[PDB]
Design a binder for this molecule. Structure first.
Ligand SMILES: Nc1nc2c(ncn2[C@@H]2O[C@H](COP(=O)(O)O)[C@@H](O)[C@H]2O)c(=O)[nH]1
Ligand SMILES: Nc1nc2c(ncn2[C@@H]2O[C@H](COP(=O)(O)O)[C@@H](O)[C@H]2O)c(=O)[nH]1
Lengths: 208, 208
């Protein structure tokens, strides 16, 4: 039989701050069920390569099948909300993450395993609590990039990747936080490489 | 529906018109082999899916090696020129196409097979001859998008995908032509889905 090699090296576990996704010039919409909790939400678990490149949309014959994760839906509704317009259930977002990223790690996790791992990592890495534990709150104030990185490093033991975007007022703000997981999906690891964060020395942590 | 490949659905065989790549606000540079012939050049062979998505960067451990295509180099220099700046040999362009697209079909064609297939497809489909036979010439004049599509469809049996970019005056021009091939790369097929053309009803076919 033909043996196929893994198409990726490690994973980026990415979380987004709703306050930064919703205060730009573009529109954002709360899920049909209402305003999500003021906590970071899961964006996705992304297979990536050591050289910075990453595989995407790896298996057209492995379409998202929500029935395979029915027992995880309530947790996904709370921890993986969609903020796109018009107001959605979250399914289009979850389907997109599985088809674009999950399929590229099919040899490691099937659909249930993929979403479960993301949920477990989310509970393992509570960014809001870690940051507020260090006096960094989503109150519209400004914080140094290094204070954010180090507060997280001291808490989980690994250096995070920080991505920023811009609000309407033109201020640079904390948008997404990346944590690396080994290729086997078993444990956290230091990131072999970090994407361009586009952050200033000091950034805003907007209220939501 | 019929499938011919395991991880993706079909292929887009894409060719570019040099006159349209070189007359925009961006710079273009003739390759080290000199000014290319005034004919369409290969852009690449791209695995694509029925839902519009496409796999990309499927194997970072499979770098492009010119040794794998040594016997195809002459054909590649003549039919697959790079027009990017600064003037290049073409290796960076061919390497990019393999890394981004070729690797995603590595279980169908290896490097030599991939480049050979693209070269063979170009031999089979002479777009310039087909168009000029239908009175559509690269003389800077405008032609109907429909007449361009009909000419190609009458010749090969299926409608092509047509993509337009913009020239210095802002006008849409015939830039790239997409031909659909099944997942095995052995036969032309009706396109399950077409690229967003961004073409007006009348487009220019610029000189080169
Ligand atoms: N960042 C983000 N994308 C969302 C959300 N809901 C739906 N989407 C969609 O998911 C895509 C994310 O692609 P990715 O960043 O995983 O490669 C977005 O471009 C958008 O179409 C949301 O709440 N946040
Ligand atoms: N269209 C085009 N791209 C070229 C050429 N030479 C080098 N390139 C590079 O190849 C890339 C094409 O990526 P693709 O369209 O295959 O996904 C471009 O972004 C550019 O960096 C050329 O002659 N035409």
């Amino acid at each position: 039989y033909v043996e196929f090699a893994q198409d990726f090296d490690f994973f980026y576990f990415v979380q987004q701050w709703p306050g930064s996704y919703c205060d730009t010039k573009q529109s954002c919409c709360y899920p049909k069920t209402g305003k999500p909790a003021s906590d970071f939400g899961i964006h996705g678990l992304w297979p990536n390569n050591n050289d910075g490149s990453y595989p995407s949309n790896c298996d057209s014959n492995s379409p998202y099948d929500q029935s395979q994760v029915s027992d995880l839906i309530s947790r996904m509704q709370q921890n993986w909300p969609t903020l796109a317009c018009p107001s959605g259930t979250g399914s289009a977002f979850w389907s997109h993450e599985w088809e674009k990223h999950g399929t590229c790690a099919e040899n490691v996790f099937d659909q249930h395993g993929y979403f479960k791992k993301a949920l477990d990592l989310k509970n393992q890495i509570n960014l809001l609590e870690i940051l507020q534990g260090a006096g960094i709150h989503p109150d519209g104030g400004f914080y140094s990039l290094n204070s954010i990185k180090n507060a997280i490093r001291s808490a989980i033991g690994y250096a995070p990747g920080i991505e920023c975007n811009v609000d309407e007022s033109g201020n640079s703000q904390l948008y997404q936080i990346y944590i690396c997981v080994d290729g086997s999906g078993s444990n956290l690891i230091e990131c072999p490489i970090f994407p361009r964060g586009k952050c200033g020395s000091s950034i805003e942590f907007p209220t939501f």
